[PDB]
């Protein structure tokens, strides 16, 4: 999964991960509430005002509320509430032993001079006891006095800030300047509870995330070692330790994120810089206004002009990032993954495609994954391999080619061909899955979609001209009484079943349960399933495809003109192929992915082709 943290699992890497963006909203304490409900309301017209960015830099006093910036007046309530409805409470400056200021709002400030205005959340996690069981700290940073955010153009302070954080180490070294003795506390009162500091989640964004790594980069050497062991999760830093400690999540649209190179100004921290970074995922777009706008973009992208800061505002953060958490392509996913998060404001989002642009990035590699937002999206999948993800609303898809899922979500919704039904083929396992193949063999796996939209240059069945709306039904796809059939298929059970195909050439769906698939002499397309299926070509040009977790399959008779599918499988790496995935057993190849194989029987690894074995 992209947000896979040490060793933890993909599950428990995800329930970090949604605590740290827990805990990082609260500590703006809705800052951003008003602008991003305008933004979703009107779009983003009006662009972004420079005291949103001095806001975001400098902190607020405080409260509301702020001009233009709409103010949210349950910014508070809504703000506590949703971190305790995330397990979260903040602990007190009595419960610490802490001498020092807190105010109404529970919110700690910084211990020395030049970071007095920085901020820090101490939340606790307790069991259904009232044991407490995690510690939460969420650092809000600044960049020193808000009065000196105004006394030269936003682009200058900006420039002139980031120039700053690298020398004599002043980022490296913030949380200790700023929360030296707080966290001194932290580890007596973590120690009287039984806590060690793997049971501390580090986390913030923005000027937060560059103290989160600060503190990873200290963790060794002060407050006895204690927090070494702890989990930092850094949104939109500008900043990367030098530990291997802190995952470093971001929008790569974000001028912020990765703005810097570790701490060090670059040529690129003014422009574009997405240069590839270990600690960080790299390639994460959010689908906003601002990406998808030819007018917004006319200017260089660039961290000093302040439009551009639409991507790294935190309920986006927030909203976005939950529905890749949420996603059923998550576990297909890794750290630089290239995922398309749908952001769009409504008025936008009735007509904008939401489709990896590629814009003021690298190019991207590998499969992308397209995540929809819960009301109707317009999603376009490029002539690569697409995962594309509607949730609910209606949702309507377009793809340009390759080997794809699609999966709808609730409501009804619409795949669009853009071309004649009579370029594509159609099949079915009565599972759910509607399966589409171009004419190029190219393969989608859908599912949840109940209109299939073609464009007819002619009249289809002397009928239908131009675009033409398909019913998706068991019996095929209807226009009224017409049918265009599926294609021949071999429907198996939920159990162990021997299905043959017809000298045709068929489909064979085993489904679940151990299958014996036997193929003829036609060309066949083998769906095993679930289980430990044994798929036998027996001649002709055979497609074999394997989806999810598809079990310990072994194919036999596979031959040149024969092609394996891996679509939606578990190990991917961006641009993997299939040797990185192979290995000799005796007389076999054997192709991995992650507990799921598939074994090629009697067939030498020296004699495959990677056009043979499509790994998306
Ligand atoms: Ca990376
Ligand atoms: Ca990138
Ligand atoms: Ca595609
Ligand atoms: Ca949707
Ligand atoms: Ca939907
Ligand atoms: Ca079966
Ligand atoms: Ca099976
Ligand atoms: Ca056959
Ligand atoms: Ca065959
Ligand atoms: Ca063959
Ligand atoms: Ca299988
Ligand atoms: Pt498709
Ligand atoms: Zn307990
Ligand atoms: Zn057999």
Not at 513 to 530: K, M, S, W
Request: net charge negative.
């Amino acid at each position: 999964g992209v947000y896979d943290y040490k060793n933890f699992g993909t599950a428990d890497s995800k329930a970090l991960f949604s605590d740290a963006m827990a805990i990082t909203l609260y500590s703006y304490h809705n800052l951003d509430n008003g602008f991003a409900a305008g933004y979703q309301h009107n779009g983003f017209g009006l662009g972004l005002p420079a005291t949103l960015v001095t806001a975001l830099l400098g902190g607020t006093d405080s409260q509301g509320v702020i001009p233009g910036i709409p103010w949210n007046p349950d910014s508070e309530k809504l703000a506590l509430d949703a971190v305790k409805k995330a397990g979260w409470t903040p602990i007190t400056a009595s419960q610490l032993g802490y001498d020092g200021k807190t105010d109404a709002r529970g919110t700690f400030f910084g211990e020395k001079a030049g970071y007095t205005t920085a901020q820090v959340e101490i939340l606790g996690k307790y069991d259904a006891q009232g044991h407490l069981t995690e510690i939460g700290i969420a650092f809000r940073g600044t960049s020193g006095p808000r009065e000196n955010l105004i006394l030269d153009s936003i682009g200058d302070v900006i420039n002139d800030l980031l120039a700053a954080f690298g020398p004599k180490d002043y980022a490296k070294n913030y949380v200790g300047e700023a929360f030296g003795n707080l966290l001194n506390d932290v580890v007596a009162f973590a120690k009287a509870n039984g806590l060690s500091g793997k049971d501390v989640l580090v986390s913030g964004h923005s000027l937060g995330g560059l103290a989160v790594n600060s503190m990873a980069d200290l963790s060794g050497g002060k407050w006895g070692g204690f927090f070494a062991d702890s989990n930092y999760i850094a949104y939109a830093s500008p900043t990367q330790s030098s530990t291997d400690k802190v995952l470093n999540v971001g929008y790569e649209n974000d001028p912020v994120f990765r703005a810097l190179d570790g701490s060090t100004f670059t040529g690129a921290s003014v422009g574009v810089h997405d240069a590839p970074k270990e600690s960080a995922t790299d390639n994460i777009v959010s689908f906003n206004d601002h990406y998808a706008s030819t007018a917004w973009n006319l200017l260089p992208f660039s961290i000093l002009n302040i439009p551009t800061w639409i991507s790294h505002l935190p309920t986006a953060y927030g909203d976005g990032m939950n529905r890749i958490i949420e996603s059923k392509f998550y576990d297909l996913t890794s750290k630089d993954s290239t995922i398309i998060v749908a952001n769009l404001s409504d008025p936008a989002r009735a007509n904008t495609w939401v489709q990896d642009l590629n814009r003021n990035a690298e190019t991207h590699k590998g499969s992308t994954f397209i995540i929809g937002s819960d009301s109707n999206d317009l999603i376009q999948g490029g002539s690569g391999n697409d995962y594309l993800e509607g949730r609910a609303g209606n949702d309507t898809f377009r793809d340009g080619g390759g080997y794809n899922v699609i999966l709808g979500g609730a409501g009804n919704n619409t795949l669009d061909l853009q071309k004649s039904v009579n370029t594509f083929d159609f099949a079915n396992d009565g599972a759910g899955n509607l399966y589409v193949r171009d004419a190029n063999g190219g393969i989608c796996i859908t599912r949840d979609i109940g209109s299939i939209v073609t464009k007819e240059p002619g009249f289809l069945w002397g009928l239908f001209k131009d675009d033409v709306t398909h019913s998706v039904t068991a019996s095929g796809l209807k226009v009224g009484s017409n049918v265009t059939q599926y294609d021949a298929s071999v429907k198996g059970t939920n159990g162990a079943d021997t299905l043959k195909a017809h000298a045709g050439g068929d489909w064979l769906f085993g489904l679940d349960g151990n299958d014996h698939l036997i193929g003829g002499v036609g060309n066949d397309v083998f769906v095993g399933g679930a289980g430990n299926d044994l798929m036998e070509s027996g001649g002709g040009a055979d497609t074999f495809l394997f989806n999810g977790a598809f079990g310990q399959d072994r194919v036999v008779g596979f031959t040149s003109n024969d092609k394996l599918v891996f679509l939606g499988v578990q190990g991917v790496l961006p641009n993997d192929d299939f040797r990185a995935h192979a290995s000799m057993v005796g007389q076999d190849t054997v192709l991995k992915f992650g507990g799921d194989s598939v074994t090629l029987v009697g067939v030498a690894l020296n004699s495959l082709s990677a056009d043979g074995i499509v790994i998306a």
